[PDB]
Symmetry: none
Subunit: 218 residues, 2 copies
């Protein structure tokens, strides 16, 4: 699996350098956490990541799913999606799905279609619908939901197998930590790390690199 680390624009150059040295394959630009969202500022950031040999995920999280409103969000996608290896758009932002799929497809890039639930792991039918809709819109479905028990972790992983295809599975919280490593066996293609952990369940980049080697020989 590929290892990604989210980053805002603070001390960016040095954090990118650290992400590289520590083994990150991807840097996710959380533009919703940027103090500057001009098309050039973000473009240069994407280019700087590529300059270091890493891939990028262009994310501009909507406020309803843990992000913040970005006035020129749609413009950023139009202009930068063709330049980022991946673009993460929320399944809930229905009006941009077809549009971002066409843009990424034509540019030979990939679309991640995400769903986040910071409170609980939804019923199985919802898990399956999110996955099926993601594939229906031509993207890599991503599900990030808080586990309130170990059962919630097992359930998310097991139910995901009922909808075939590469996907991204994350059980957030202390209970779901194991999902960040074990997800691979269930078809999860990307795992997300912290550049030390600041929240329950996170795993530092350096540690995940060694775990990936120990369990999957990469």
């Amino acid at each position: 699996m590929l290892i990604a680390v989210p980053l805002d624009d603070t001390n960016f150059s040095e954090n990118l350098k650290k992400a590289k040295e520590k083994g990150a394959d991807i840097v996710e630009l959380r533009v919703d956490q940027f103090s500057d969202t001009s098309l050039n500022y973000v473009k240069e950031k994407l280019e700087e990541v590529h300059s270091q040999g890493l891939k990028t995920i262009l994310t501009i999280r909507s406020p309803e799913e843990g992000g913040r409103e970005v006035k020129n969000r749609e413009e950023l996608f139009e202009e930068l999606s063709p330049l980022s290896d991946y673009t993460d758009i929320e399944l809930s932002s229905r009006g941009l799905l077809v549009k971002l799929y066409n843009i990424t497809k034509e540019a030979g890039k990939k679309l991640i279609i995400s769903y986040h639930n910071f409170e609980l792991t939804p019923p199985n039918w919802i898990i399956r619908e999110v996955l099926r809709e993601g594939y229906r819109y031509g993207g890599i479905p991503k599900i990030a939901v808080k586990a309130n028990s170990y059962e919630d972790v097992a359930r998310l992983l097991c139910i995901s197998r009922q909808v075939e295809g590469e996907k991204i599975l994350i059980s957030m919280g202390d209970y779901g930590k194991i999902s960040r490593l074990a997800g691979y066996v269930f078809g999860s293609v990307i795992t997300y790390c912290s550049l030390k952990a600041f929240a329950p369940g996170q795993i530092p980049l350096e540690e995940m690199v060694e775990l990936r080697k120990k369990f999957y020989r990469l």
Copy 2:
């Protein structure tokens, strides 16, 4: 008119706070849009609205009218309709009308009997029949239909006058935007706003528009 803001379970507490601070009168719980519809998860949300001093509309939209299947739908109405200020049930959910009226009436609450058409504004006889049936079942009839022209908006508003009584009238879509503000003069008692689709109006804007146009 009163202003209602529909909300799903996403970032509920934060959204409710904004709704209260912006001036909403009602929060409509779109339970059909919830991830968890258990009696406790929903009851707690209902209590939260009341804790902020706002009224609630309990809605569990049927898949027939733009919602989705909710297995414990009946339990929710049975247990929560006596607590919610309003309960919205679809006229098409004929099997639950008498039951919901009895539950709400016994509890001193109000029943909204709704009709939704996301494609067009139906013929006048249908508009009148929906209003008549709503009243016949003891509820506040609600008609939410897509307007495909300004003519459709004027028509929905004018024909509704033929069946007197409190009601809720909404012409959805860009053309029907004006109905969200002007419906009140035609007897529409509640208007719906987004907290922050074509034709919707943000809560903050509607609160300002209401005071600008309506007499104290």
